[PDB]
Design a protein around this ligand. Sequence first.
Ligand code: O69
Ligand code: O69
Lengths: 302, 302
Amino acid sequence: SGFRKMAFPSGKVEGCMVQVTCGTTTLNGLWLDDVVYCPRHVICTSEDMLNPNYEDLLIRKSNHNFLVQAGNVQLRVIGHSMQNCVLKLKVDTANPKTPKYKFVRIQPGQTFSVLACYNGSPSGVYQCAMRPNFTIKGSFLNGSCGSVGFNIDYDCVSFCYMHHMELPTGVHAGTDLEGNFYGPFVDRQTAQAAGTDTTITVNVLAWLYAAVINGDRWFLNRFTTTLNDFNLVAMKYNYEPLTQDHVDILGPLSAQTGIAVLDMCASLKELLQNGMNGRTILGSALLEDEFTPFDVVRQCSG
Amino acid sequence: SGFRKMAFPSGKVEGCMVQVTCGTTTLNGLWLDDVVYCPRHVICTSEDMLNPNYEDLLIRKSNHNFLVQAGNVQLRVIGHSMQNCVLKLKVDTANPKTPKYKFVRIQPGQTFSVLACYNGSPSGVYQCAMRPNFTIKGSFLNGSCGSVGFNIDYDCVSFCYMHHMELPTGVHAGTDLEGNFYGPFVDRQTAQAAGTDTTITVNVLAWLYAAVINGDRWFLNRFTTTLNDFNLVAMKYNYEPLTQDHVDILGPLSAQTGIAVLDMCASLKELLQNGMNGRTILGSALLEDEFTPFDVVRQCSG
Ligand SMILES: CNC(=O)[C@H]1C[C@H](n2c(-c3cncc4ccccc34)nc3cccc(C(=O)N[C@@H](C)c4ccc5ccccc5c4)c32)C1
Ligand SMILES: CNC(=O)[C@H]1C[C@H](n2c(-c3cncc4ccccc34)nc3cccc(C(=O)N[C@@H](C)c4ccc5ccccc5c4)c32)C1
């Protein structure tokens, strides 16, 4: 029993992290086969970021302008290209530790593990969620650019995030592994800011199911709500609308606990309208929204 | 910026996890050099656990009674011995992925990363703390016995915990890697239970320093307290006594933020006496006590 913020084992990703140096700036890169992936703003000076034309800036660079270091051995760059906002450095050596992997662009509300890295060396691992406003509330300092987020399914590492920048509110913005930013953010020094955020409703419900699985029932009630009447309350408390697909996704958890999905919704409605009254759920005094239904199944069932 | 429950990268430990099978029971083992470490109750039937004499039970076993499987390859047991409550199976092959490692017995209040494992395959990683009552609030299901806890310093893996059992309250008890249980617990089916627990005061203070480092100051005040007057309040709220050594340990964090340790104590005193009044600290509505001063330095400074 028990319930924790569980990250995936990071070993398969640790063997892929390298250090990329262009000029006076150094960040992290992802080494898969004979290609190293890193944010394209590694080629930019501080003055370049005011209004960068990356096509113009990259054509002035050559292969020897990039130093790739994997642990102790230096990797030679034999080719470079630009795909959206990620730079791809072809190297003469294929990574022998390359795992089975995919590149996946995730939806808001989905979770992933983050391997925080500095100078190509892994520093720590933690679980994150893609917020509805397409930021992540990570833990990143200077030099963490190029750290990646990922999920693991059986044997395959699904990379879904690469860290690019920190917004003024202290939250973080990045791209998928093919260089497309999540949200409206761009790799340029401008006045962009994180938009208003909402609570991931389907995740709160899954986490309430996790509490029931672990033997906590104090928040349940005898009531049921309609999907429409629940979403009227969700809108009032800045919660994401609950769809029929979300209800269908919560099916297995509802079947294991014997609590209908719309019954759990009436419980969440009561929790939003009255608060938690000094009690806690799974050790938290707040409704937690960074566990997907799949996260709960993975941990409460192994 | 940001602050998360950060576990250590688990790659060095993943390469050491194996599966140990004795009879009809299977659990996890730790493979370092030519020795596999696992809980000694792997040799026990359910009826053996009522009043086991492990010396008597192990002398009836032979090397071929143990099946050790590292991924796909089966490892041959060439010797077995018992050290306190851990069984040591000598194998004919030394683990090529053996990292630099120590065995360390930690103090209550210290934190470590847990690599939850099932059938020798890593399932997830999360951060834990040794509670003052010598239990851990982990996330473990059936088959997780043999999973280990660890810290990493530079290149060395300091193993400090091996999972043995789950107590009736759903918390977990285990040993160091030399077989000595934390707390008064024993590997026998008896009516043992977790004792009353307390809050790790020095950790709450470090976590308040982390909040200041990340730009939050709403809980600070102009007041100071004496160490004796603070401990009078700590005792009232089931907090661990704060020692001069704890004050000295919080030195670097106090120097970086410019907030004296006893000044932070007056802030914590006010927080305990009035609550948090609907506000949050680092995204939590409760005072968090599973970050050591070293944990905060590691994450807020990289
Ligand atoms: C809005 N700025 C940004 O978030 C900048 C500062 C960021 N940084 C980080 C970094 C990553 N997580 C969190 C951070 C917190 C504090 C300081 C730095 C970081 N680790 C880095 C490693 C190497 C270089 C940079 C850097 O500074 N690069 C320069 C060329 C730069 C300048 C302005 C930029 C504006 C927008 C996007 C990218 C921009 C990029 C790095 C990119
Ligand atoms: C108080 N019981 C226990 O916590 C028992 C049940 C535990 N278990 C776990 C396990 C580990 N985390 C959490 C669990 C939650 C639910 C069920 C099992 C676990 N994964 C296991 C993998 C293999 C075997 C066992 C097991 O069941 N072994 C048998 C011989 C046993 C029986 C009674 C015991 C009493 C005390 C100590 C050890 C005892 C051990 C395993 C050891």
